[PDB]
Write a protein that binds this ligand. Structure first.
Ligand SMILES: Cc1ccc(NC(=O)c2ccc(CN3CCN(C)CC3)cc2)cc1Nc1nccc(-c2cccnc2)n1
Lengths: 11, 264
């Protein structure tokens, strides 16, 4: 869960 | 001394703020007073003006209330990206637990959206699409329920909040203070978060002295508004509970879904 949030953060 | 380390922080945060966000409160206020030499925003006061205004508004690609609310979603989703990019610039934020990074953002973003949305608001209406539009408060009230009630509390909060006449440089530390909230449900390792926030709060305090009188009293006013926010954020998510059931047709943006998941 929270895939896009993880993506934007590790981006 | 360490009073120098706090001005470094306030200035680092302010620079990240300018770079992370398209439109500063400075410009937003200039536009809202016409005082800007830049072109006026297309004014939207009814469906006719909205339909003529599609021109000068960042497009989307079926009902006006739902289409307006659909406009807010894309704006919110861009704001979450700008806020997430800014959080990454807060010294020690990216060194926190990636689960705690997600948690702080999950709860933080809507509070910061409403803080910054006040920058675009007066009693009469709201600057949209980076100042290219101006949607009137009366028009947004005139939307059918539950969409009519969607932005009134944000207008209510903004008129109180704009009182404190805070500047962009005040707002940069304030929103950094809101993200670094130790008391967010689900946080694993609180003390590192609480440590950073203490740093930011000192910087906020110092910043507010160097820019405003009745500083401790302003600084005090400004920290109570920080709970006026959690209120309207809670009220907002209940209205989306309402809208998710009552309007099964309209779909919510996957990123807005990741955030509202198990929120209040
Ligand atoms: C109806 C409304 C209310 C609020 C907003 N804006 C926001 O919700 C919002 C919140 C925070 C920020 C962050 N921003 C950065 C910092 N600056 C100083 C302050 C705020 C930006 C936008 C947009 C809209 N409406 C909107 N915005 C863009 C497009 C459309 C739209 C409407 C109809 C058809 N197609 C598109 N509609």
């Amino acid at each position: 869960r929270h895939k896009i949030l993880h993506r934007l953060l590790q981006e | 001394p360490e009073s120098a380390d706090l001005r470094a922080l306030a200035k680092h945060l302010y620079d990240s703020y300018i770079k992370s966000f398209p439109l500063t409160k400075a410009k937003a206020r200039a536009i809202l007073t016409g005082k800007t030499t830049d072109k006026s925003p297309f004014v939207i006061y009814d469906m006719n003006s909205l339909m003529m205004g599609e021109d000068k508004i960042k497009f989307k690609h079926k009902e006006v209330a739902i289409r307006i609310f659909q406009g807010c979603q894309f704006a919110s989703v861009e704001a979450v990206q700008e806020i997430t990019e800014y959080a990454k610039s807060i010294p020690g934020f990216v060194n926190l637990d990636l689960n705690d990074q997600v948690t702080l953002l999950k709860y933080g973003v809507h509070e910061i959206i409403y803080t910054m949305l006040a920058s675009l608001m007066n009693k009469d209406g709201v600057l949209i699409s980076e100042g290219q539009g101006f949607m009137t408060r009366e028009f947004l009230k005139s939307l059918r329920k539950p969409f009519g009630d969607f932005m009134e509390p944000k207008f209510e909060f903004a008129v109180k909040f704009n009182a404190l006449e805070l500047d962009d440089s005040d707002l940069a530390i304030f929103i950094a203070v809101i993200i670094l909230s130790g008391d967010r449900p689900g946080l694993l390792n609180v003390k590192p978060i609480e440590d950073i926030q203490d740093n930011l709060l000192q910087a906020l305090e110092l910043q507010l002295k160097l820019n405003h009188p009745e500083s401790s009293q302003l600084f005090a006013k400004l920290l109570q508004k920080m709970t006026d926010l959690r209120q309207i954020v809670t009220e907002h998510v209940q209205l989306l509970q309402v809208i998710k059931k009552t309007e099964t047709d309209m779909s919510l943006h996957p990123l807005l879904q990741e955030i509202y998941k198990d929120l209040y």
